[PDB]
């Protein structure tokens, strides 16, 4: 058996075909087992509709999850990714850097 802690990246992108749109992305990578809980938070509160969740694996040992949704951020609001996994003794909260 193997277990691997997820790596978590939080970042924003504008789709080229719709440059005014802005997406907040969670990239949760390299984890095992696949059982996982992932939320986007806005001001400590969970975001309800998250347009997309794309799950894949490399070889059998490793999963990859892209979690993302459109958003309109102000300089006041705060966004984060919360991840819970059996490898983590406490839920991992990764804040969005407004420069990324």
Residue numbers in the entry: 0 to 99
How does the study describe this entry?
A recent case of systemic amyloidosis involves the highly unstable D76N mutation of beta-2 microglobulin (β2m). The D76N mutant is strongly amyloidogenic and, in contrast to the wt protein, aggregates efficiently and abundantly without seeding and under native conditions. Indeed, the 76 position is located in a solvent exposed loop between β-strands E and F. A detailed analysis of the interaction energies of the ensembles reveals that D76 is at the center of a network of stabilizing electrostatic interactions that are lost in the D76N mutant.
